[model samples]
Target: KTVRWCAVSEHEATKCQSFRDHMKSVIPSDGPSVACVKKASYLDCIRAIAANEADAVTLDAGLVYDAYLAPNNLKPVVAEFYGSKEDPQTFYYAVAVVKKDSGFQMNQLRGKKSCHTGLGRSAGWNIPIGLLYCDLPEPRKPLEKAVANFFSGSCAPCADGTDFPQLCQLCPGCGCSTLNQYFGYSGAFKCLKDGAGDVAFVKHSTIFENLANKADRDQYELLCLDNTRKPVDEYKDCHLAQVPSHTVVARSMGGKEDLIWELLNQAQEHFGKDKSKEFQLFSSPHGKDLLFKDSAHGFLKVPPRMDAKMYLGYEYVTAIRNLREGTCPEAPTDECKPVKWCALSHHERLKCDEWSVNSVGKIECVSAETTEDCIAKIMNGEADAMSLDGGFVYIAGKCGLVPVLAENYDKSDNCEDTPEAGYFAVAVVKKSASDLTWDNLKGKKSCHTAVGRTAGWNIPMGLLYNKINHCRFDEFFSEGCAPGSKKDSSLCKLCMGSGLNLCEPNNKEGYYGYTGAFRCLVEKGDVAFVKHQTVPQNTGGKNPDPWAKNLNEKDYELLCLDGTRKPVEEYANCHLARAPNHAVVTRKDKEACVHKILRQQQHLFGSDVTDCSGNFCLFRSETKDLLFRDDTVCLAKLHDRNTYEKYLGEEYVKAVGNLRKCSTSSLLEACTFRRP
Candidate 1:
């Protein structure tokens, strides 16, 4: 009979390398050559177990708990092969990703198009979607709407915030447009890069390094990963897509166990310290039983042969707007018809006639194929501003674009048509933008920066007309621009917006002054307009473009400079309250055998097989670094390459006050203290 084994492929199969190498090192004559077959995906490993084609799997701890159907209780050999007493205290954390340069946020997007991997795929889809759904705002409740969509996958189109038809349809098969349109809705990362969708939901691990490597770490971050509000009395196991706590167990029908264990021992000794490596497996008595507790009963467990399906035409923006604005009754049945808007590129104009001809009502749309296109529109007075994703807006703002308004749909009635709050900045001409009155330079030539840069033009102009011009604080307002103005002309000057605050011919002030470079000069001041960054088309939230609000003395004016905002600390796990624990489990029928194994390994050698599930044994080695309790604290720490290297240079603490014997604490201390 062929021996079978399971494993995760993230490490490039390096995990098996040491084990294989060690087996050769320890027993040169172990005899049978153990083979290690690499799998392309974790699902394939699970499939191997189900078909009885493999004996055991060196897979994720979560898999043993959630993967495999009846008759398949994958025996886990180890939870984590390496690390300290509290390294991977918990399991997975989800993350959301947008283009490296887009400006999108949870509250800002209502119904805009989105992209993600298959729903059934743990890290690629589920957790990120779950996080978004959990954080939806009042009135809109996009998360609630998404949950509804999940259960009612392929039914008739449901209105925003309504219950779904049948979620099973959401899988690749059931024509479930809702899922494709809303959650787990679209393409993979490649698809996101090429498509016109906005946000992308994926496991935290998938994009964490990519975002950091792209040098856009500050531009993108986790909106909500471990931000959970656990019920006081109800502690739950890790339920995320990509957790860090789970171990890597490798057994071989293809390779020898001892050989594999030898390599694993060495590798496990180096895991958390290596930024490039995260998972390692160690030997355990209970095997798969130690990792998975709620077999088949977990939230992620689902039907077999899964495939990703996109909800092609869902309108999250319209639905959210209506939910927030209260146009639809709160939680209205899926029968609501909400308003949705789609945008064209900055260089492209809305085929408004086509939309009109098609009779698509209640739609507000614009087009800007490129950043310059949007800027040009605002500068030339062709467009006041543009709407795009949140990431684009922030990038633009950093480039000296301005943010005019941060409207909250939750508080407004017009937002009833959708579930998201709209974020956008106004655009204006530069010359008329300054605190200086228009009359001060009536004869000066005027110029605007770009189309959508609100700070460049919008905010400056608004201040001039409504605040300075109308407020009447300057002497120029009373006398007008004409030398000793005529009675009739002077009186008529009251209507002139330039009459309020005129600039003196010889006046000179710094950047923040009335004529500062960043400020707009209605008459003589070249008007800075809002220049927006590009984003995927058809997004919900208005892309963030720094008009003037993001500018400083160096930026703005004709020269164009820089701006500032908050640093990217989105993923810092400052407080680890409770940690995740290992669960002892086994096949449904082999309880007694599983119990005997646990007892033999822990000391009560060969305990009766009748009682195994509830028996708790003192943890010794493997997986001790993982979280075991719900409130376990993760602690605020950076786990990047630089941080890990720096930490390795420090003093190594002795475990158990110099317990000479090899134990969990001693091993962790050695790993922690040793320089890389």
Candidate 2:
């Protein structure tokens, strides 16, 4: 005789009963009754909802997306509203707050103790931590390790100590859930207020609602990325970002959506802020904001016509997705169909065709002029997959592509066991250029493989931007051939056009790749920016190409950041930062087929396979970085489930994102596009 309402746990179910009893008292006799149902996990509740064993539950946006996919098909019915009654909205800002006298800006908080609401909650943990990790160097470190290294100490509830002991070092030795004394919004702030933490990450309204004294409230300030601090109330103008709050979701079919809405409306009138003394709709006495935020003023009905995806705007959805990937623990395949492999050049297509023929038509090669073109093809169902550089991998991710496998190369005498192993970026100059140094490279002729390529642009430019505090690379370098730069600009002034392919991204440009950039330094330019192995592999007769056949390693030197030069092999101690390797990518739906076809192709033609003919090399010899790195030993799985952010690392992705901000091309327009 009642609707079965799902709760995430017994504790949440008990809280649900409190709300249901209040709802029954408010609603008329003819109104539908509600029955509280306990589920051990959010995922179980989702399954129960799909199975018609449970009706509705409040879900995080991340969980909403999971329910929106495949079998569950739940729709968000109500959104939590969190401002003053006069100016209420369904969204709130997540902010970092500190004492006014603390005198610390956002950037200066390195090694400071911190407090978070909970592990996966949007406001406390996800938004702030995700943004902070983007600024750190080795983002691939376990989140717990990274946080432990970055912060001196503090409480982050729900961290596993055995695996990440440093993350638990700051806590007061409490449990890892809501039962902990330092857990959610109030608890995290309590940690900060008790002199246990330097910073507190919580909802924007936390300080406003928690502290009653105007004087006590005046002591807190909000940290902004612009390196300034403001009064806590100024969060709207100076906070991390706005995020969607909790939402009541119901199964898509055969659910009492209308009855749920009716019950919520009636319950709000009585248990709402000013109506009931026995129970407050928003406040919780013992735990931090049970079921809904304590600061939430009321509930607003989501548009009856909209689904869960529509209700939580795209930007909010992506933020949640980023958090889910960043925090969730590690959690594929087959097709006989001719898997369409995308290529950025005709050379790649040629190799693909040969590999396809060798595999007896397991793969069909497809071609595109640029990485963006290949990604567009996959999105529109024209191509199944393609390999991408770190720069393009970031772009592919922003466009909703997933990584299938990453190129693993031999490192020093050992083959890497994981896809996360990367290569070093280095600067090369002629051995005679003794006066040039990292501190004084300005106004010198420089050459780059191409704009938007990893080592060619992002790494060097990121370092330059950090040094000069601006993004005017043209002003820093006098003249050079940066392939893929505008032909009319001075950035391409020194380019010796290779027939028709002047300043192009591909092989047609005279100085357009690792080989090309080295050629620029050899023939004309003062410096060449490329990968570390570029010199040894192409010089000293290591390369069979006509241009490189006469070159010697002794003719060139690797530039070190410490005002000295070293032999090319010393790139380990005298080079730019290490960079992630290129990866094969596909749509999430096509990942299985692409992985299967590539595995078979590699078995037949990979670098380790001795039976393959010279003409059918998996790592080709004719071109440099034609769809794949020539030195690749094998295709390795991208661990931690291959989200582009994880595969590329947060620092690399952020560096690429910063570089794209200065780009001027149609291929880069997607980088500037905003989803919501």
Candidate 3:
């Protein structure tokens, strides 16, 4: 019921106490709740969260690295943004600070002593060390020892206690903890100010923070990458590399991210600096940097796939890796398309590109915004393959294509342990529409997942066709929101998107997929045509979106094909028709190799590796229903009956053929008769 926060010290614990009190005052009782747990150290917090003792903690990028290791496996969920209106950043620059007119360029400083924020710190340790390591070729067993030799002497705190003793000898404060007087930005700059070293490697904000007067700040300069020194303000050009700011992390597996994100959003609204005075989430009364950095404005939820390596970014992560492993990535190792897949949207296209790499199948992506266009691309040989719903498989078949794979959903209960070849298609309406049944559902407004998708459009349309004897679904429904149609039609009217692209049939269409279609049913439409699991998945708080968050599966009912109504759970018997699971499609001649390529892809990125250890998931698209359905366990050949009509079933294919009697498909018309 409460999201437990991890606190590193009493200063943060006191703030967390006030934070818990603030949540009760601001959020409704039904809203997310908060509590805090005190831990001995930030490292303890990471372990606590991973072990389920706590939910979240704010971590520096350096510590974020530690949390990503096994047993911890934490991921960043929120990011800190700092800087002024002129240049607000979720990242900061690592700059090397030196006294003005010291007259030493970057290349000449090999033997010079240096001061650093800390040994494990980004700006101080990783950034500068990686640059010096790449600043060229020779790297040894111990990166710290190599650094000790690079500089005749140095003062880098928080290092391993036993080895590299001279690196910490000049510290104004001693011992390995952050207690070292010369351990942080202010302390390290003090080492530079007191002449303990020739340069201090810290953040661009280091000097402005430590020096009170602007005149005093003017006494320092920045060492540029071009072997020249520039004024400190020129850090934009002179810094070693940009470092991502501190982040809030949670367990990657079962962390309550939606609740945690909601809690942070609510807390920052009332407790963020410039917002409230009773308690502060980013500041402390006596301690220096307690819960979050004092510099941050607030937090931004990190994008999906936000592992430590991703949130830290390529350049900075590689920099950190170079120092941790004592090796630099080689420069310009040249290589390397393969099956040009038709992607449904930007998110799908993006995931496909990552899969294209580290792939033996050599698959590439070509954007085909709609399913029909994906079929068109395969027909014209512009793109090799993409997954299609049962309906599109029918249409693609008529265009001389074949099903290369069958998306396996559920498994047989017996020892065969086999996934069912298909899923149920059912019509869902509010339980309050208790009088509604299949026979009386004619004039009601409807919602479809998308135009060519099966459960949403084809199967539903076919069932209606047996009675209506026509394919004019828009006329039959009175009004509906089925995406992938012209904006001028009634089909897209109830759909939502970012204005111009509204109802444009993709994730962009807010009412697009099963989730989106179900949302349309919740907000506007009379009934929704979706797969069996859609209702259960979106209701009961499983959907984080506000509309579905408060909904319960019991509040929905299924309109049966036999003119009776039943609970959504009775989908096995009450469904309109059973439809084959969506499948990847390709040209008839290309089926063998195409299926082979996908089989290889599944081994590398399929459900077996659910965490996507190497960062490529064949089934996940960052958004739902991309190149392949996110629900896809793996692609399977239909026992070599991968022909479209066989996989789609004789009755279903017959229904599709009859529906085309009212409106013929051009792709089928052309491919059946014309050839290049």
Candidate 4:
């Protein structure tokens, strides 16, 4: 069987093709077959693999996390181990290197010229980004924007030059690939060694790898978390975070995962770093880290338990999560202990502040780094309430939380009556693809909002589970983009994540959530499974984006269950299932306080309060659906159905249960196991 290796650039592509070309004659025809697919960026290669256009790609820890989340659901089967063959290490420390004579301390990091491996990477981006910016007070802008201003200039290669030009000021080129001179660990160290930057965020081994003599290496020192300095060898004590080494990722559900491993396992056995002259498997001559790290000795199979979250470890994952999606900033509060609301993004943090200020000092904002952390934040009593997806509400319920209020899609702030609630999930197809319908989608390209959202995944795929008669979703469709789905292979094929977010299952993913899925079908995709409102929200000149800028609603059509079609407005009749909306969760004991707070806040700033003088809508944010759903008109009380089991409803709960036919999340399992 042929295993297509995804390559990020022409450099990596050539090497990959070379390996395929050379390996054919030497090995028997019966051995593993290799092919290559070229993409513009690391995230592109990742998306290609999930989409089944490529079988596998080696990636940094940060990229691995992107692939491992639902939708892509890829696993790190092979690890690139370095240092020595005798006792190869699968992990490395991300270090902050500075000139010994500079007299710089951790407290004085602001406005210093900085160097990074690249944007959205583990050592260069995730680890260092987390270590810095712990002191910002509030509405400073996005953390990434704040960082651009924090440093006088930087070389975060592969960063956007237009939006953050100063951040790219020190770079040889504002780029990420091999094209950028000051890229990767050695390059970042080069930036500092060349005096372009005062500090470099790189691997701990970067200094020694770049400089041969002790004298040259001695010019640099490790900037410790304690604000002191240490020798380069003291990196073990002074490093930023213990990052796992890079690894090869493949789709979990139906990927040629075994074939990928066997091929690599066989290749390493035959041609390691020092094994053959025909080719050295790890060494790259044209560029650094062409296909694999230049110094990687060989690959070892990672443990089965080691998914992305497990590989990165909890502390590191938390840091990355909080850095990317955490709350705005905690506030200085009033007399009584304020209910801390766990906010999940910089934009939402701003909205949370508006709520905090207007609530008469009753609430304070606390940043939550990840979805897992959001639940933990509430469980640990560090924060009180935040609305969660129906999928996450299940996890929160599993870990001691109760639903306080379900978000109402329409305007209603009543305790007296429960609005018969939910949103409709619908299938969409282009009018041009008239022959394409629900029954003929066997080999067609498909799209979805996300892996576990009610309208995006469960209502669409779970219903198809019975028709296909098995769980092998990869076998059904030729390719599709379902962000964060367990079935990677073709499910991720149509996904289009670029630059830092290639095929990421979150909002950053081009095809993530309701809008993204709809957009997917509007372009190259044959069909999309999403919420009904997704159509109206984007079509008819509403989106104004380049793709949807001129598109009319008449060009698209919706597919119904019984081999029929309908207009987008007819979703009430032509739908798969109506699913419960996201709800705010808190501990059972604190539901009363959460309810009181929600009522008080809504009286002035809730969606129902259309007459607010402050013009500060509690739900409005820079990114849609922050703090609470943007579509929500009010936080509706569910009477006695404030518990997770009853609130999600039996039908919707069963659908979520059916969707998860395979492994429970390592992150979710980790949360369950943390009980005292």
Q: On residues 538-593, what C-alpha lDDT tens digit does candidate 4 reach at each position?
A: 87788878888867777788888777899887788787767778888986556777
Q: Estimate TM-scores for all models.
A: 0.26, 0.43, 0.44, 0.41
- Which candidate, 1 or 4, would have the higher TM-score against the true structure? 4
Encode model 2's per-residue lDDT on 1-676: one tens digit a residue. 4667887766667777888787677767777677888888889988998888998877776687778877888887777776665565666778888988797888677878888887766788776777665444366466677777777776888877666665555575535766776788888888888878888899887887779887897878898755778999788656765555678888887767887777677777878877799788777765766666687778876655456544553334545555456543231022346788887777777777776777777778888877777777775567888888777787777666778788887643333345554877788888786888887888788888987767877877766665545667766788888887677455687787755677788877788888888888877788888988788788777778767776988888888867788988778888765698788988665676777778767766777546555547777746676657887888886656677788865546666766765764443443222121
Candidate 3 residue runs with Cα over 4 Å from true position: 83-89, 97-121, 134-145, 152-200, 207-234, 285-288, 294-296, 327-676
Ranking of models by lDDT: 3, 4, 2, 1
lDDT of 4 at 375: 77
Any runs in candidate 1 off by more than 4 Å, and if so which?
Answer: 1-27, 30-55, 58-63, 66-71, 78-94, 98-113, 130-198, 203-215, 226-676
Two-way TM-score contest, 2 vs 4, winner: 2
Put down candidate 3 lDDT per residue, 1-676, tens digits, no spaces: 6899999888788878888888898788877788989999999999999989999999887888889888899987887777543455777888999998987987678778799888877788778887677553354656677777778778988765367766776763345555666778888898899988899999988899888888887889998765788888878656776666788899898888767888888777888868887777788786878778888788777644445654554346556666677654466332212577887778877888787876854788788867776777776567788888776788887665788777876533321125356778788988876788777778888999998777898778876786677656677776779988777567777777777887877877788888988888887889899989898899888878778876989888988877888888778878877788787888654566676777767777877635774567787767676777777767766556467877876657766766676766555544332111
Per-residue error at 476 for model 1, in Å?
86
Best by TM-score: 3
The Cα error of candidate 4 at residue 657, in Å, is 38
Ordered list by TM-score, greatest first: 3, 2, 4, 1
Predicted candidate 4, C-alpha RMSD: 21.2
**Angstrom error at residue 548, model 3:** 53
What C-alpha lDDT, on a 0 to 100 scale, does residue 580 get in candidate 4? 78
C-alpha lDDT of all candidate models, in order? 0.31, 0.73, 0.76, 0.76
Sum up the clashes in candidate 3: 1
Best model number under lDDT: 3
